[PDB]
Design a protein around this ligand. Sequence first.
Ligand SMILES: CC(=O)N[C@@H]1[C@@H](O)[C@H](O[C@@H]2O[C@H](CO)[C@@H](O)[C@H](O)[C@@H]2O)[C@@H](CO)O[C@H]1O
Ligand SMILES: CC(=O)N[C@@H]1[C@@H](O)[C@H](O[C@@H]2O[C@H](CO)[C@@H](O)[C@H](O)[C@@H]2O)[C@@H](CO)O[C@H]1O
Lengths: 424, 423
Amino acid sequence: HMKFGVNYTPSHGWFHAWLDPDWDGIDNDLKQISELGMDHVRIFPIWPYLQPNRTWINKKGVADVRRMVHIAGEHGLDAYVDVFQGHLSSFDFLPSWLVTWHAGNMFTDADAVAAERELVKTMTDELSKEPAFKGLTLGNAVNQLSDRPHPTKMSATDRQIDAWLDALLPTAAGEGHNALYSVNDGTWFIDGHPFTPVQSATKGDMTVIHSWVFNGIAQGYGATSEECSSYALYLAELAKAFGKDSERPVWLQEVGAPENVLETDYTPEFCRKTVERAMDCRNLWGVTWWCSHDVPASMEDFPFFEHSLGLFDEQGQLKPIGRTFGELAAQYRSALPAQPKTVAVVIDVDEAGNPVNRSALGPGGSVCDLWMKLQVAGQRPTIITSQVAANQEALAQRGILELHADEHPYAARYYTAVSDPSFE
Amino acid sequence: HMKFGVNYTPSHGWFHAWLDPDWDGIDNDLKQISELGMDHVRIFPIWPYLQPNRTWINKKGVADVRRMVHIAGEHGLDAYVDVFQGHLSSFDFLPSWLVTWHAGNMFTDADAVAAERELVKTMTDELSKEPAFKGLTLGNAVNQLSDRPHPTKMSATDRQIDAWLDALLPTAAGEGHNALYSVNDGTWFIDGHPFTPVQSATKGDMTVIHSWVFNGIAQGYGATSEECSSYALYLAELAKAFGKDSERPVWLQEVGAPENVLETDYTPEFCRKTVERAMDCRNLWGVTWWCSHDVPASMEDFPFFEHSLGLFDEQGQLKPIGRTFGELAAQYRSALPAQPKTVAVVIDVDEAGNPVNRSALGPGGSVCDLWMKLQVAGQRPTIITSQVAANQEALAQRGILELHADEHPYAARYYTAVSDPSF
Ligand SMILES: CC(=O)N[C@@H]1[C@@H](O)[C@H](O[C@@H]2O[C@H](CO)[C@@H](O)[C@H](O)[C@@H]2O)[C@@H](CO)O[C@H]1O
Ligand SMILES: CC(=O)N[C@@H]1[C@@H](O)[C@H](O[C@@H]2O[C@H](CO)[C@@H](O)[C@H](O)[C@@H]2O)[C@@H](CO)O[C@H]1O
């Protein structure tokens, strides 16, 4: 069974709805989503509304998240909840006790981590009362705060991020639901980034990826190229390469058709092709489209393409990409896992198991260029580390017959870490 | 008539009460405040809850502010509402469309100002439906974002601040209420600060001051000293010295008894002496104590003394300082204005009317020391600018017979601009 769902953006009020929720409108949103054949939603509370003080949790805010989970369960949806937003569509929502006069570091400050731990525990304890609650994500792209290009970064070493993850994820655990975190693609593509590919493929219950072709994939390879619609597949094969466990599932927790780089008329086809190719990774556990509903036009300072990432429009009308994604779910939720792959691109790793050269992995880098060349020639390449490639027994076990290495590496020609040129 | 009131800190949840208002608790808070003898409260909504997107105002949040004003009026309290928080008790509440990836300047960015104007208009129009709405203050100490030592300042020139005020204050105007703004004391004590004394004494309806002796007054002169308990008076005479209307009211909009520089058991006497000396200013319109209720102990990262600034404790019982303030209100709300003064300290100003040397006005500065010395000696000194001092006719009309100039100026020796050394 392959899971299909959406990242739920409330159609009246966006995530400002938490400040004045239109519950009848939220019910209409979730009914529509369910009637499209989705089996789950991802839900995003706002951190400074849940925890306005380091030692004071907004109990009503928690109850509002529980209510939203409950409504989704009414309509047969499983609910996954991200806690630390944090970052949403280019906006940072940070509690006042971590900014300006109270500038702190949410990854390395002992009492910040303790308060985070307490909120996760409060959230897990309360949401576990809803059968529809199926997993908790530490937060949406929590890594973006930890490094440049972020203009007020909370820097950390990878060892500190190891300790941060090890301090929060066990608190999210419990029977009946998963414990996860998410990162943006800087984890695989930015050198010296403290969130690492090994962490993503070892900590938490599944390997989580967000697939966004405005990072240079559409720009350099071509919006309609096969490379661009194979990019979610490349990310899935890339992320799972760095785990101890070759069977660890991969969750494509975010994937959208951004119209700052794709043509509007092309997005249905882009969606179909991207999903189908992503499903050629046999570790793939599910696909969660970004996003459910257009961001209200009355709201400003969004990069313009964010307003039309929806499967429904602002009036609640189903868009053509929406119809396509619902057709993908009905056809493929019952499909069999993909055949294994016998051709692998090899990535050199250090002793810890992380790429020594991360810049070569991004859009227009030597490793990406190599995988794309092989993919578009029908060689169906998977990805492995140099540690696995050196193990002749593992290779024969995994069935791999042909290895391709990055013979002369180069940095990512196309890569940009931001979604809009005005953030560069 | 002299006004007595409090800055309203909700006893359950503090200003985080806005996220989940316990309306029976707020009604009871305001009832206890009314029964102590206060005639007004000052209310603090949170800006990122009212306007979480530049072009999207939370109408529920607006309505919640209206309801609080309405409850205040049902207990016979006048309500004064401050909009841009902004800053509360060492915490900044900034909307996400002004920070990090969207970092902008709330003073000089055209569309931030237009959005600020839209929120002021929205607030004014809703709150004007409530008879208890007597005043809109742009925000609590809005100058603190404009300059050092703020760690992410939105810098601005004094001309740009002139334009900011002139763009916002007409929008808050309306029949039945005042339009004002508020600043911390860096306006008078920090050279080069873009909020100026002439602005405070000319823009908006009243000269607004916040009097906090942890700025070096208590440390320098001594917590129990007469100079320390004469500080609110000094500040009121100082702030009104820079307005071209000699009759413009002065609102002592915040004054508290901070236990980081005062001993707990002294705070009632500090309260009595501070208030009694401050009423020796002829222009003083009212005193508004900080604050009604202790900050709940379960909330952390406050400077420790913030917790006990209340007139009521966390159980909602009247504190000894609260008893004193209720007794000051009952004794002095009918009192007649103070006698005029004949001894003046003269401050040299530029052609715009602003102090040449602001640093000498601060605690332990040469002008502060001069005025304290005369005040301690019994000479009831007022303060005028060199422009008034150069006109022998104006002096006689004001009945000033003796002038003291600052002949050897020096910078403020005691002044600190933050409430806590941990900043
Ligand atoms: C500041 C910036 O450029 N941030 C972007 C993120 O917004 C983006 O996050 C994902 O992408 C969608 C569509 O833009 C966005 O609405 C959500 O926040 C989502 O989580 C991310 C893409 O990997 O890239 C960052 O650079
Ligand atoms: C960062 C900092 O030190 N800020 C303080 C302000 O908090 C303070 O404002 C007033 O002080 C009381 C008690 O500290 C506080 O609860 C309110 O914010 C109030 O408005 C100001 C006093 O002049 O000093 C600043 O430095």
